[PDB]
Paper text:
PYK (EC 2.7.1.40) forms a tetramer that catalyzes transfer of phosphate from phosphoenolpyruvate (PEP) to ADP to form pyruvate and ATP. MtbPYK adopts a tetrameric architecture formed by identical subunits with three domains (A, B and C domains), similar to typical PYK structures. The catalytic site is located in the cleft between the A and B domains (lid domain), while the C domain harbours a canonical AMP allosteric site. The allosteric site binding for G6P (sugar monophosphate site) is adjacent to the AMP site and lies between the A and C domains.
Unlike trypanosomatid PYKs that use additional salt bridges across the C–C interface to stabilise the R-state tetramer structure, the motions of the AC-cores in MtbPYK require the disruption of C–C interface interactions between the AMP loop and the C-terminal tail loop (Thr455…Asp470), as well as the hydrogen bonds (H-bonds) formed between the two adjacent Cα4 structures (Thr422…Asp423). To study this type of structural plasticity and to probe the mobile secondary structural elements (α helix, β strand, loops), we superposed monomers (instead of tetramers) of all available R-state MtbPYK structures onto the T-state monomer structure. We then further analysed the movements of superposed structures and found that Cα1 and Cα4 both rotated and shifted by ~6° from the T-state (yellow) to the fully ligated R-state (cyan). We propose a three-step ‘rock-shape-lock’ model to describe the synergistic allostery of MtbPYK: (1) Subunits of the MtbPYK tetramer rock 9° simultaneously from the T-state to the R-state in response to substrate binding, movements that are coupled with interface-loop interplay and catalytic-site formation via the movement of helices Aα6′ and Aα6.
Numbering used by the authors:
A (entry chain B): 1 to 472
B (entry chain D), D (entry chain A): 0 to 472
C (entry chain C): 2 to 71, 165 to 472
Write the structure that this text describes.
Amino acid sequence: MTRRGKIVCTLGPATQRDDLVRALVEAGMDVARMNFSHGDYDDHKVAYERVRVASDATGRAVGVLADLQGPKIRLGRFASGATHWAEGETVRITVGACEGSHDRVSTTYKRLAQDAVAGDRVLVDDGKVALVVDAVEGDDVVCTVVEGGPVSDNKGISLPGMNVTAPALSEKDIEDLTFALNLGVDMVALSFVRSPADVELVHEVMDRIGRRVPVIAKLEKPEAIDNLEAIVLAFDAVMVARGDLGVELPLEEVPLVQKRAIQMARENAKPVIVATQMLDSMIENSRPTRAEASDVANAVLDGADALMLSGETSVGKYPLAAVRTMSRIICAVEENSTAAPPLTHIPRTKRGVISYAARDIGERLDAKALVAFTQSGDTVRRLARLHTPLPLLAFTAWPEVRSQLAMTWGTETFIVPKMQSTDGMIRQVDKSLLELARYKRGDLVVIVAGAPPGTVGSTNLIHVHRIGEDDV
Amino acid sequence: HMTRRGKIVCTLGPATQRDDLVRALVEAGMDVARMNFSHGDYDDHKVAYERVRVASDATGRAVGVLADLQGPKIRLGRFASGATHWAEGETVRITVGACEGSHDRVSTTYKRLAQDAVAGDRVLVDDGKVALVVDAVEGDDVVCTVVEGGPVSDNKGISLPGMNVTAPALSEKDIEDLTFALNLGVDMVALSFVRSPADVELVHEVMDRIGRRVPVIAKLEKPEAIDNLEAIVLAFDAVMVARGDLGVELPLEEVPLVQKRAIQMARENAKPVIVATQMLDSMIENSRPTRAEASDVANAVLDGADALMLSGETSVGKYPLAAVRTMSRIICAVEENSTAAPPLTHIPRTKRGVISYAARDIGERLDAKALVAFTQSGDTVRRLARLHTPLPLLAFTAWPEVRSQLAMTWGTETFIVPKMQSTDGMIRQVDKSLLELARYKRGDLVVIVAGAPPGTVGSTNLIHVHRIGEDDV
Amino acid sequence: TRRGKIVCTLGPATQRDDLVRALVEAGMDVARMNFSHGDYDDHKVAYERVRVASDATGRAVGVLADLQGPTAPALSEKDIEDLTFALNLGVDMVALSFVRSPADVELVHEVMDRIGRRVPVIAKLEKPEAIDNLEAIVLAFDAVMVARGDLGVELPLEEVPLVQKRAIQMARENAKPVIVATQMLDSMIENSRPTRAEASDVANAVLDGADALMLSGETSVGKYPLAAVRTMSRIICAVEENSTAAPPLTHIPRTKRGVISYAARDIGERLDAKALVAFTQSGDTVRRLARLHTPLPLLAFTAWPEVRSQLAMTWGTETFIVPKMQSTDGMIRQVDKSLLELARYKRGDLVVIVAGAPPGTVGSTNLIHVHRIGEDDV
Amino acid sequence: HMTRRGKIVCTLGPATQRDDLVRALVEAGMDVARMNFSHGDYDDHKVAYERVRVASDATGRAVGVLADLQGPKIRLGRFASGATHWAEGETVRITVGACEGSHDRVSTTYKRLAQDAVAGDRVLVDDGKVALVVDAVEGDDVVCTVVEGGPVSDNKGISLPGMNVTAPALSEKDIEDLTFALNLGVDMVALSFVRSPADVELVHEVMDRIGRRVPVIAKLEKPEAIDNLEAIVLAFDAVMVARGDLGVELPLEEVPLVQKRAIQMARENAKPVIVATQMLDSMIENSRPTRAEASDVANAVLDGADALMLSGETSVGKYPLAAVRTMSRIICAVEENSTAAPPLTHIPRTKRGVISYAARDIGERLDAKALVAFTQSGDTVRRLARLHTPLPLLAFTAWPEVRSQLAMTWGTETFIVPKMQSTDGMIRQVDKSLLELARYKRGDLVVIVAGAPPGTVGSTNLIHVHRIGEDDV
């Protein structure tokens, strides 16, 4: 009926101009990403509020997503500005301070010396240049260049295979998380996730400050894909970072890891975001490459809850066009086929059997919408992963949840009061839906909800009715 | 299956008039009591009727009361000697005039026989044991030739397959009996000799004149009924497969397929179906049935029948209790052995239908202890019963009459409750009613099917899964 | 024409001149010699009268020798004598009474292998211990006979109709033939017509899925032996001409032989074939198709005439004798030749043939071939 | 899946002319060699053609040869300066007359451009990198305005979306190239610029004049082709999805769905489908592909494609071997992971079709080591290939040409054998051929699909299941 798949946009320099955050929202932004690798806390505060004003003004829900940097592992500065590391040369990467020199340059990752051992590979600038550790002589990691090429200030370094010992949250991240939690963000994404235990360190900080939001694990490393199931269960959502996965994994394995992660997320009613290398050409162009449009469309077809724009909106010259184009692709894929990859988990539990039954009933009776009452989102997220073409309307008393459900597939959320009785809950649904030009009296709707209000049995009720069938 | 699901109808007569015998039936399993208005004066019925109601109250078991209307009385008159023998090839006269019976000439009770019969029509006597053929009508007399010979005696039944019979489906006598039964307070009425869907209208005329309707059961006795099977099942509220009678007027080998087809047809439309006659007739004189009879009963059960019926076995027999116990024991045995009954083919398309199927699925998938259905007329319960789900099926109704009417519906126990004021109060009532009987306890999972806000214009439209007393404190 | 098969018992009542032939003409498919009655000479004379009748009419007729049976061993001393006699006499099958265990067949096989001649052994389901081992017995024996009268002596009477259904099902799942016997038309021992209750009972055996039904005293000692067979036939036909199908089978085929039989039926039905043709050396391939109770005519072709008699008791199967086949292509040409000699089917009519790889191959059934009659006729 | 199923097409050019390089491709996995008639003179092709045939014989691997016809050459002429710059808002003239190139005015190779162009038509240049709009046709000059600016050089491609282009599908030059290729002995021909199902007839005219037909592959390059997708897939023998070209004339977001739709359409009709353009273009300059490219390839495989095609990657690139090795490695990885492919909706209705599906079922159910199909033209094997069954699929044919033609069909290896004399002999041949391979041994179960008696009128009509050498001595 409208766009189902959700769009995440990154905020940066390019979205600071007059009424531009609002222009994004109007073009379709559902979640706004605050990237804490860049900007001062003040730039974020001002972006954060511009989103909230835009969300109020337009009426559209917009979640706010705090992206934590994780371990900053990159080159230091060169005195020259740049150099060239040709094959066979010896080079020293040091955890000490030094001036940028062809033969010797610093790294930001202070533990590199203690972690590196003879043999470990060291990749630079998205794996464009590759080195190998010969030995650790004090603060210096002595390497040999295996694949040559140009190198400059502050290029990324990847250490596949190496037993890296940084925690998932740096000291700097804890400050950023704390800031974001107080600022009022709706979700937090953790980078460099390697184990299901990594969520605990985010939860420590949340419980100290006394405020928890959904935590999104970013799938960037092989160790993450090695624990894919345990991670999807321990976190609240996942983000497939294809660029980063492509650096450390076989390139041919990556398209299958994407599909597998998306499937895994849907089986467990967790949201999945697909990020990186989406429409990167639109950083410089008003239109994408054919290859990019195809790639995006396959993310949609793979079953993804949301797709994410990075530089396309954060630094690009065509931020609106990027969002409009992502929308137009998502729509086109959806308008063409209902079908998404089938799920294999058979529902066994009261809440699961009911979610499936509700969808069946709704589809079989040609309902105009599927209404789900929810206190945390769980009940709606269980319906969303089915990719039913029924509009999916969440009704909740907790307004935070409306923002959190911005990143979940096909879902619009309405904020309503706490319900006093089941019959009152039906009356509320009528009231809320009739306010919208979309619905009128006579339209068939399916409601999923709680026995007597605030019951010990959670979701346990399916109710089919036409709007205002009992009004006179 | 935790209990007997299939229901048992028993006929009341001479054999059930002595001391606390109606009660003995009920305790043995009788779910519906049949009052057969071809025998007894109105006083015998009044006394039986009340004995059933007292038994029902005493035991706590629901017992429906079924008024069987006679329809056209078509049989031989009396013979002066008491009997004769009509041997093959002989000419014989069956007359609408009064006469004393002789071999050559005997009267019939069916006064229109002369004007209805035509050259060629077959005239079958004594459950089709002897067959004649009309050569012509000379005045009073229908002049026949014997095709299959055998003995004939006073007042033996006559069946006229193929013949353009012109009696109405409701005789003058039936209208009196119907009127009596309606006022007496019976819960259902069965019409004999049904040939067309229109036949129900003549019963409805009488009901609406007296101002009281009950479910009307079409008895499938004639070929013309099976010719209109679908239109009849839709127009009536239930059907009864009368096997003996169908066996006389159709090829005997076609009957087992007609039974299956009628039962199927009834289940597709959420109408009850009763299977009657040729059940355990040997038990009129014997304490045990023939193997062939046990097989017959079991096949009715397997065919998908809501209820099975005893006739002479309880109404005139010498072993009425044993007959009911035996029918029960067979029904149980068939059920305890397989869940499976013939699949239904109607795909549900309507809100009420989709919900009934969904409720059953949910109930079975979650291993619910019972499936509870609220209902004003039975419709919602009957839609679940036809599925032959092994979940106990508990109807909740405000109308007490319905509890008696649901006595003939498969697998169903009914509870009578107050009018509900709110949906949440309705859930609380279900808990209260179930807990009264020390079968359900706190924690047992049940599925409820019911009405949006109480007295909603959308009838049944709600499915609700809960464990008993999960919210009490 | 009739699909379900009829077994008739021979006795005093069928010794009249050309009465056996009258049975065969009325429909007898299997002739039962009951070795609890008669001298060996009465059997010899009946045996030959059947064989002459079978030749004369052209109709296949199996001969089933019924060992009386007799805690007791499975085979009495007397049975061993009767079995030995019957085997040499040339019977096509043996039925064993009082079967209680799957091991019981071994004692019959000992005797067969001593004399050097094996035929199918039919276990008679007469006792509770048999029903307790129903599956193991159906597997060890080659066929089963449901004796309802006898089961009714020791079992709850109401349980018997469900045991009948269960045994018939069990037999069909394992491609064994099942006969339903006892209490069929016993009234016709004294009457020219049966009770309604009896006609209904027979029809229920048919509908339950039975390969064959059996007459006992009705033909062996009755006064209306022909009428009994004619009436059983007329009923079986009438039941068949109505009902479409038989109780579904649930056993999933997993073996080469089984997967092919199911596939052949599917292909046949999907393509609207007029017939299902089976080549067979031992019967197995035909028996696998018969148990399906497919409404397709089922035509068996065999070189071994003993097998044509043995297939007489399998459902819906007509069997023809042909020569030993020299090559697969020759075998297809034979099927065309034989089918045109029936002149039953027409120019473009499809049939499906199931057969053996190269003739006398170690893989038994392993070939499906769809062809039109006279398609390679230029 | 036991080996690579999806097939690889490689284009031959300058980069594949060096020492034993065609052979190195074949060894790396090339199944079809594309001869592109937009580059090279007839002598370069003759030498490539023979190098392929020698390589095919030497390695034992089947290698098809594919003649790609240019179709209408629609592009810029030459510039005197060599290149220019067309900036937005400027007026420029593209002329069908001869001239040397200036900024203001340059010639086109497409001589009909004047007669075809009308006010409003768009003119896209160099893969749509620059866009113009026609203001008028003033004689030989098509006077345009630049809508999207950018650099332009000698001999750049132009696309004319929407414009009623009037060139036939076969130029005069193409007919010469087709004729050459047919005599040379190529196994298939691909036609560019296909717009209608009638376009195949013009190729068939030429084939029938020369007296030799091969499969004709329609290249899906234009919107009009996708508008007739079904009629085209039926009239041609195969299709090639050219995504780059479709991307210039169609909405970019629609292209991924057109690819999927064409692949599906081809499989439903047992026609091969090749997916071409922009597969691993980065490997023209690099020893490894972009992640986006590997993903794209893998999605073509998953979409259901019979074959994937390399263009510049092998024809002009610096890593031609690595390109084919990499394409192989991706195809394998996708396949080793899931045997699932998009389901088909085609229900088989015909004797030959029902049998093909039944054979597959039987094979899969019995866990056969291979499915052997006898075929005169390929049709029988192509009907099994589109099912994407994980059974090895072994074609047996007496026509050697078919082995080359089946090189582009999914999952299919072909064996060339003598004409069969008898069905039993044909089974013996299957054993003989398979036993030569160390892959098969005595005892392996295989399913054979074939013809009744050899040279029967009833096409495919026989399924035979056997273990290799079960009757051996």
